[PDB]
C-alpha cells in the first residue's frame, strides 16, 4: 500500500592495514536495487535489478561521484571518532547509517528518517518533526550542535520530502512490474520416524515471493503454537524464499494433524495433510 | 585558508611546472581551475580526498598528485604556451558545498627566455596648469617595456604606502600589438591637493614589483638577468 | 546540472538599483550560490540558499530561491562602487562545481562638478619626455582607443580623494614621436565641447 526508498551506508575500518571499507546499498520497498563497494576495482554505482539497467550512463556517473565523496567523508569520521572515544588505534570500527522515505498510499511523505550508529549502537537521529536531532551521547551532542549551527536539517528535509519522494515515484513506474510480482508457495509435508513410537511432521513451503508467510499447525481446529519448531524464513537465492514448521506426533495419530499456509499470493489459505 | 605556491611563474616551452596548493581548512575536496578571457573558471582536476585524482573538464596537459589531505598540486609535465594563464585552487568541506579559493598564480609560458625584461619606471610631475585651475596635483607613474605582464604597482608617499587618491590601470598595454609577444606598459596616478605637492619636504615614490626569473633559471646574455625585482622612481 | 546568466557586461552609476539575471537547469534539488570575484583576487562566496524559497543576503545583495521560475536573481537596492567585480551564479545538487563567464559589473561614480581638461606633464628626471592627461571628465563620456598605431592611450580609470571626498576620472596618453601634441591625442575620442586645453 505504502512504499519506500532507503539507503544503507556502512563504513568499516580494517586497520592497521589501510583503507576502510565503504558500502552503500539502496532498497526500494525493501528490495535491493543499487549498490556501491569500495572494495571492487573500478568502484562504481552498480544496478542490482534489471529494470534499473534502464537508467542512462549519466545516471551512474552522477551517483558514483556522490558515493565517492560520501566515502571520503566517513573515512575521516571513522578516524575522528576513535579520538573522541579514547580508543586504541589498531582495532576496527563501524559507522552505519540508514536514511530514506516511507510514503503513504496518497503518495505523501509518511515518515522520513536518518539514523546513524557507531559500532552498532545509536549515535544520532532525526526526529519525526524533521527539524531536530536526538544525540545518543556526549559525543553526538557536538555533532548535533554543529548540524544545527549549519542548517543541516533544512537541507536534508529538502531531500527527504523532495528529491527522495520524487525518485521513489520514478523507480516505481520503472518497476511496477518486477516489484509487485508474486509467486505462491509450493507446499508439501514430510514424515520422519522418532524413537519412541513418535513421529515428526514437517510442513514445507518453497519458492514463494514476497517473503512474509505464516504457516501453522492444528489439531481439532486449534493452532499448536507452543509445539512447533519453526525456522526463520530464508532465501533460496532465486530469489524466492523457503520456510518450514514441524511438530511432534504419536505414531498413528497423524491423520488428525493439518498444516496451514497463509501467503498473499494464494487466493485461499492452503490446508495440508500427510500422506 | 588555502594558499598557492608559487604566486608568479615564468617557464620555457617544454619544461616541467608544478603548482602546489596547501590548505588549512580541514577539507576533503580540492579542485584546480584555470581562468582566461571568454571562458572563465574551468575545472582541470579535482580530488575527493587524500589519494585520488579525478579528471575535470579540460585535463589534457596536466597531471595532479594528492599526497595528503592538505596538498594538491598540479604538474604541467611539459609546458606549452596554450597553458599561459591564471590558476586557482579551491577546497570544499563536502560534495556541492561552498568552495573556498586561493589567491591564484600567474603563469606565463614562452619558448624563449630572452624576451623577458624588467620594467622601466619614471614618474611625471603635475602640470602647473592643473594646479592653477583645480587646486589639485596629479602625478603619473609609467612602467614601460616589460615582459610578461607580472607586475604590482604602488605609491609610496613619505615612506608610507597610500591607497586614497590612487588609481592604476586594470591591465597593461601591448606596447606594440603587431609582435606576438609585445612588451607591456602600465600607468597609474596619485592625486593630492595642490598645497601638499608644492611643499618640498614631501617625498613621492612609485614602485613596481616585477616577477621574472629565479636564481636557478640560468642566464646566458650580457644584458643583466631579468629576475623578480623592484624598480622605482621618485620626486619632491 | 547547469546555469545560464544572460548578461556579459553590465555597467551603472552609483546608487542605481542592481539586478542580474539567473536561471538554472537541474535534476536534483540543488543548493544555489552567488560568488563574487573582486579584480586581482580569487572568487568568494557572496551568498547561498539551500531551500526554495528563501533568500540570502550579504553585503547588501540578496537573492531568492525561485523554484517556480528556476531563478536566483541577484538584486541590490543601491549599488555602490566597491561592488565593481565579476559575479558568478551557480547551482549544485552534488555535481562538481563549474563556472560560466559570469557578469562583469562596472560601477561608475556620479561626477559632481565636471571640469574636463587636458594637461601635459614633464618628467621629474629626464625633463624632456611628456605625457598627456585627460581628466575630470564626466562618467558617461567614453575614451576610445588610439587610431594611430604609435600613440598609446590608457582606458578610463577613477580615483578617490577620500578625505576630500572627491572622485575623478582620468586617462593618459603618450608617444615617442616628433609631432605629438595634446590637442592631438584624444581626438579619436568624443571629448566634451568645453574641455580646457591650456597653452604651454
Amino acid at each position: 500500500g505504502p512504499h519506500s526508498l532507503r539507503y544503507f551506508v556502512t563504513a568499516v575500518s580494517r586497520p592497521g592495514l589501510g583503507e576502510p571499507r565503504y558500502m552503500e546499498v539502496g532498497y526500494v520497498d525493501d528490495t535491493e536495487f543499487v549498490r556501491f563497494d569500495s572494495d571492487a576495482e573500478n568502484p562504481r554505482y552498480e544496478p542490482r535489478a534489471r529494470w534499473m539497467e534502464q537508467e542512462g550512463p549519466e545516471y551512474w556517473e552522477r551517483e558514483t561521484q556522490k558515493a565517492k565523496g560520501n566515502e571520503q567523508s566517513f573515512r575521516v569520521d571513522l578516524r575522528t571518532l576513535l579520538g573522541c572515544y579514547n580508543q586504541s588505534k589498531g582495532g576496527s570500527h563501524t559507522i552505519q547509517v540508514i536514511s530514506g522515505c516511507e510514503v503513504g498510499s496518497d503518495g505523501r511523505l509518511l515518515r522520513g528518517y536518518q539514523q546513524y550508529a557507531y559500532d552498532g549502537s545509536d549515535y544520532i537521529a532525526l526526529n519525526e518533526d524533521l527539524k531536530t536531532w536526538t544525540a545518543a551521547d556526549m559525543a553526538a551532542l557536538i555533532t548535533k550542535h554543529k548540524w544545527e549551527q549549519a542548517g543541516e536539517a533544512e537541507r536534508l528535509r529538502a531531500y527527504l520530502e523532495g528529491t527522495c519522494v520524487e525518485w521513489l515515484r520514478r523507480y516505481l513506474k520503472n518497476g511496477n512490474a518486477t516489484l509487485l510480482r508474486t509467486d505462491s508457495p509450493k507446499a508439501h509435508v514430510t514424515h520422519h520416524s522418532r524413537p519412541e513410537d513418535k513421529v515428526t511432521l514437517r510442513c514445507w513451503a518453497l519458492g514463494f515471493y514476497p517473503a512474509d508467510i505464516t504457516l501453522t499447525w492444528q489439531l481439532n481446529g486449534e493452532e499448536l503454537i507452543q509445539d512447533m519448531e519453526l525456522v526463520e524464513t530464508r532465501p533460496a537465492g532465486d530469489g524466492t524464499f523457503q520456510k518450514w514448521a514441524s511438530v511432534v506426533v504419536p505414531l498413528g495419530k497423524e491423520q488428525y494433524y493439518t498444516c496451514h499456509v497463509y501467503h498473499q499470493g494464494l487466493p485461499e489459505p492452503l490446508t495440508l495433510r500427510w500422506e | 585558508a588555502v594558499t598557492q605556491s608559487p604566486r608568479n611563474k615564468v617557464a620555457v616551452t617544454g619544461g616541467k611546472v608544478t603548482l602546489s596548493c596547501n590548505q588549512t581548512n580541514n577539507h576533503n575536496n580540492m579542485y584546480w581551475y584555470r581562468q582566461d578571457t571568454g571562458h572563465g573558471l574551468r575545472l582541470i582536476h579535482y580530488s575527493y580526498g587524500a589519494g585520488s585524482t579525478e579528471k575535470g573538464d579540460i585535463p589534457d596537459g596536466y597531471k595532479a598528485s594528492r599526497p595528503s589531505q592538505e596538498n594538491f598540486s598540479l604538474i604541467l609535465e611539459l609546458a606549452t604556451p596554450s597553458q599561459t594563464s591564471v590558476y586557482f585552487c579551491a577546497s570544499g568541506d563536502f560534495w556541492g558545498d561552498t568552495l573556498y579559493f586561493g589567491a591564484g598564480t600567474r603563469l606565463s609560458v614562452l619558448e624563449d627566455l630572452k624576451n623577458v625584461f624588467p620594467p622601466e619606471v619614471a614618474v611625471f610631475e603635475p602640470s602647473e596648469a592643473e594646479i592653477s585651475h583645480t587646486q589639485k596635483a596629479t602625478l603619473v607613474c609609467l612602467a614601460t617595456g616589460f615582459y610578461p605582464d607580472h607586475v604590482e604597482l604602488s605609491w609610496w608617499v613619505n615612506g608610507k604606502e597610500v591607497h586614497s587618491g590612487v588609481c592604476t590601470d586594470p591591465q597593461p598595454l601591448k606596447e606594440q600589438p603587431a609582435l606576438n609577444d609585445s612588451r607591456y606598459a602600465l600607468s597609474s596616478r596619485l592625486r593630492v591637493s595642490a598645497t601638499f605637492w608644492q611643499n618640498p619636504r614631501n617625498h613621492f615614490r612609485c614602485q613596481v614589483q616585477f616577477y621574472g626569473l629565479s636564481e636557478n633559471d640560468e642566464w646566458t646574455q650580457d644584458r643583466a638577468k631579468p629576475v623578480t625585482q623592484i624598480v622605482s622612481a621618485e620626486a619632491w | 546540472d547547469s546555469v545560464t546568466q544572460m548578461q556579459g557586461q553590465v555597467t551603472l552609476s552609483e546608487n542605481d538599483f542592481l539586478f542580474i539575471n539567473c536561471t538554472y537547469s537541474t535534476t536534483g534539488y540543488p543548493t544555489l550560490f552567488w560568488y563574487v570575484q573582486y579584480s586581482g583576487e580569487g572568487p568568494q562566496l557572496l551568498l547561498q540558499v539551500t531551500t526554495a524559497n528563501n533568500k540570502g543576503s550579504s553585503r547588501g545583495f540578496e537573492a531568492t530561491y525561485d523554484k517556480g521560475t528556476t531563478s536566483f536573481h541577484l538584486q541590490k537596492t543601491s549599488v555602490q562602487e566597491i561592488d565593481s567585480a565579476v559575479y558568478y551564479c551557480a547551482a549544485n545538487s552534488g555535481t562538481y562545481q563549474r563556472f560560466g563567464t559570469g557578469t562583469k559589473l562596472q560601477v561608475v561614480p556620479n561626477i559632481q562638478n565636471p571640469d574636463p581638461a587636458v594637461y601635459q606633464l614633464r618628467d621629474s628626471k629626464s625633463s624632456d619626455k611628456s605625457v598627456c592627461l585627460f581628466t575630470d571628465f564626466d562618467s558617461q563620456t567614453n575614451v576610445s582607443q588610439s587610431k594611430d598605431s604609435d600613440v598609446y592611450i590608457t582606458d578610463k580609470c577613477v580615483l578617490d580623494m577620500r578625505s576630500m571626498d572627491f572622485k575623478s576620472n582620468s586617462a593618459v596618453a603618450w608617444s615617442n614621436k616628433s609631432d605629438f601634441a595634446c590637442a592631438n591625442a584624444f581626438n579619436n575620442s568624443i571629448i566634451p565641447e568645453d574641455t580646457f586645453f591650456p597653452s604651454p
Binding site: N70, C84, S99, L156 | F94, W95 | -
Partner: peptide, 13 residues
C-alpha cells in the same frame, strides 16, 4: 537518489 552526507565532525566522551 543518494544523499550527500555532511561530516559529523564530532568530539566528546
Amino acid at each position: 537518489w543518494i544523499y550527500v552526507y555532511r561530516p559529523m565532525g564530532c568530539g566528546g566522551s
